[PDB]
């Protein structure tokens, strides 16, 4: 179904647009040269000299997504500046207005989001070679040596690997309805295979992302203004709203591949009123609309977990457990990554580690056997 889920790249926007119309060259210059303009203290001056351009000449969807990315990166650069506390609390009206206009048109909040800086922020080097890190580049970066190419592209390659399991999801629910046991068993093993491949793709992050680079540079420009003391009241989108609005910074929780497998397998991540559930439910507000619809429509289907629990079928239970264990392997490896890239650099705060352990614990206790 057309939930904007390509069968090759999944939730990624397939072959994103690299260039806006010439009408938007003033946007594209500031975005193309964010590291240079920030380095010379010229960025904020160039943003404030902008005319208010109409979003009307952004016709197709892909050009609209590129413009959201361009404006999202400029906004983060304008707000955070050089990244050392010199912050602006008011977004100039000539960029705040078209940004908020395009954001509402695409049902996304006016802040840089995972679907912007990952799913719409890549290109093939050679269009006839496959989707490998060596054949890929990002379209925009914040500062030189911020390892944004490593962080964005590795996340994208993990997402693409997991995406090949999504084309199998309708086979699951059809087989449950048709009571096709062998079909369902094959589908589950195939999903666990793709999730286990995504873990191997995840290993690449040590080669392309440096802990100091991420923690002190890249993490700053991805921060938001919701519960942030630096902007305690939010950001004023001058010309579009009178009062400052709070919005959360980017997070892979805004990726719908990384929530749908919990939904598919009956792992109740968003159930209840806890903080982990509320966070994962909130980050859904930051996904493209087609991605929100894919999640809640999965929750409308009969439970895969209930079906397998009722069949007395060891093969079926082992295949279901294979998928759940792959999620556990992913989130356990993820806690290793967070230790290396946030915990040990902040030693030279742990609500974070409690949240990640809560989400993993919920996944592990969904296992049918083990223990």
Ligand X SMILES: Nc1ccc(Cl)cc1-c1cn[nH]n1
Binding site residue list: 334
Sequence-ordered list of residues with C-beta below 8 angstroms from that of 60, at least 6 positions apart, any chain: none
341 contacts which partner out of ligand X, a copy of itself, ligand HEM, none, CB within 5 to 8 A by kind?
ligand HEM
Residues 130-169 contacting ligand HEM, CB under 6 A:
154-155, 158-159
The rounded distance, in Å, linking the Cα atoms of 217 and 109 is: 23
Residues after which the chain has a gap (C–N > 2.5 Å) = 348
Of 277, 290, 356, 368, which lies in the binding site for ligand HEM, with binding defined by CB under 6 A? 356
Residues 75-104 contacting ligand X, CB under 6 A:
none
Of 109, 334, 357, 368, which lies in the binding site for ligand HEM, with binding defined by CB under 6 A? 334
Stretch that binds ligand X, among 101-109, 288-296, 315-323, 326-334 (CB under 6 A): 326-334
Residues 240-259, mask of contacts with ligand X (x by CB under 6 A): ----------xxx----xx-
Q: How far is the CB of 89 from a copy of itself (least distance, A)?
A: 17
Size of the site for ligand X (CB under 6 A): 21
Residues 24-83 contacting ligand HEM, CB under 6 A:
none
Binding residues for heme b: 334
Torsion region of 245: left, alpha or beta (phi above 0 gives left; psi -120 to 50 gives alpha): beta
The rounded distance, in Å, linking the Cα atoms of 217 and 147 is: 9
Does the footprint of ligand HEM cover residue 342 (CB under 6 A)?
yes
222 contacts which partner out of ligand X, a copy of itself, ligand HEM, none, CB within 5 to 8 A by kind?
ligand X
Stretch that binds ligand X, among 35-43, 180-188, 309-317, 324-332 (CB under 6 A): 324-332
Q: How far is the CB of 255 from ligand X (least distance, A)?
A: 8
Say if CB 197 and CB 190 are below 8 A apart: no
Q: How far is the CB of 327 from ligand X (least distance, A)?
A: 6
Q: How far is the CB of 83 from ligand X (least distance, A)?
A: 15
Question: For every residue of the chain, which 3-state class applies, written as one string?
Answer: CCCCCECCCECCCCCCCCCCCHHHHHHHHHHHCHHHHHHCCCHHHHHHCCCCCCHHHCCCHHHHHHHHHHHHHHHHHHHHCCCCCCCCCEECHHHHHHHHHHHHHCCCCCCCCHHHHCCCCCEECCCCCCCCHHHEECCCCCCCCCCHHHHHHHHHHHHHHHHCCHHHHHHHHHHHHHCCHHHHHHHHHHHHHHHHHHHHHHCCHHHHCCHHHHHHHHHHHCCCECCECCECCCEEECCCCCCCECECCCCHHHCCHHHHHHHHCCCCCCCCCCHHHHHHHHHHHHCCHHHHHHHHHHHCCCCHHHHHHCCCCHHHHHHHHHHHHHHHHHHHHHHHHHHHHHHCHHHCCCHHHHHHHHHHHHHHCCCCCCC
Residue with tokens 């989108």: 237
Residues 163-202, mask of contacts with ligand HEM (x by CB under 6 A): ----------------------------------------
β-pairing, 236-237 with 90-91?
parallel
Size of the site for ligand HEM (CB under 6 A): 21
Of 78, 247, 286, 341, which lies in the binding site for ligand HEM, with binding defined by CB under 6 A? 341
Of 221, 261, 294, 307, which lies in the binding site for ligand X, with binding defined by CB under 6 A? 261
Residues that bind a copy of itself (CB under 8 A): 3, 104, 107, 109, 226, 245-247, 268, 270-274, 281, 285, 289, 292-293, 296-297, 299-300
118 contacts which partner out of ligand HEM, ligand X, a copy of itself, none, CB within 5 to 8 A by kind?
ligand X
Q: How far is the CB of 92 from ligand HEM (least distance, A)?
A: 28
| Contact set with ligand X (CB under 6 A) | 114, 117-118, 151-152, 155, 158, 162, 195, 198, 222, 250-252, 257-258, 261, 327, 330-331, 334
| Contact set with ligand HEM (CB under 6 A) | 154-155, 158-159, 205, 209, 214, 251-253, 258, 331, 334, 337-338, 341-342, 352, 355-356, 359
């Amino acid at each position: 179904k057309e939930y904007h889920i390509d069968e090759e790249v999944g939730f990624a926007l397939p072959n994103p647009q690299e260039n806006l119309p010439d009408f938007y060259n003033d946007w594209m210059f500031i975005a193309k040269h964010l590291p240079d303009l920030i380095e010379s203290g010229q960025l904020r001056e160039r943003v404030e000299k902008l005319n208010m351009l109409s979003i009307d000449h952004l016709t197709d969807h892909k050009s609209q997504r590129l413009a959201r990315l361009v404006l999202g990166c400029i906004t983060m650069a304008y707000v955070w500046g050089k990244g050392h506390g010199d912050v602006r609390k008011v977004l100039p009206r000539n960029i705040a207005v078209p940004y908020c206009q395009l954001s509402k048109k695409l049902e996304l909040p006016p802040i840089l989001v995972y679907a912007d800086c990952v799913l719409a922020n890549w290109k093939k080097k050679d269009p006839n070679k496959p989707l490998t890190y060596e054949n890929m580049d990002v379209l925009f970066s914040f500062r030189d040596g911020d390892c944004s190419k490593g962080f964005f592209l590795v996340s994208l390659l993990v997402e693409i690997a997991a995406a090949s399991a999504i084309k199998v999801i309708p086979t699951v629910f059809k087989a449950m309805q048709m009571q096709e046991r062998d079909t369902l068993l094959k589908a589950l093993l195939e999903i666990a295979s793709c999730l286990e491949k995504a873990l191997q793709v995840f290993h690449q992050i040590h080669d392309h992302v440096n802990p100091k680079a991420f923690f002190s540079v890249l993490r700053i420009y991805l921060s938001g203004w919701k519960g942030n003391p630096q902007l305690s009241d939010g950001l004023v989108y001058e010309g579009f709203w009178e009062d400052p609005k709070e919005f959360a910074g980017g997070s892979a929780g805004q990726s719908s591949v990384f929530q749908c497998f919990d939904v598919l397998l009956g792992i109740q991540q968003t159930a209840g009123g806890g903080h982990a559930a509320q966070f994962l439910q909130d980050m859904r507000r930051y996904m493209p609309p087609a991605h929100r619809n894919f999640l809640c429509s999965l929750e409308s289907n009969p439970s895969v977990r209930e079906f397998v629990l009722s069949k007395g079928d060891a093969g079926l239970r082992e295949a279901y457990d294979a998928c759940v264990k792959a999620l556990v392997s992913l989130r356990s490896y993820h806690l290793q990554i967070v230790t290396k890239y946030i915990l040990i650099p902040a030693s030279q705060g742990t609500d974070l580690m409690n949240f990640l352990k809560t989400v993993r614990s919920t996944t592990e206790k969904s296992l049918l056997k083990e223990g």
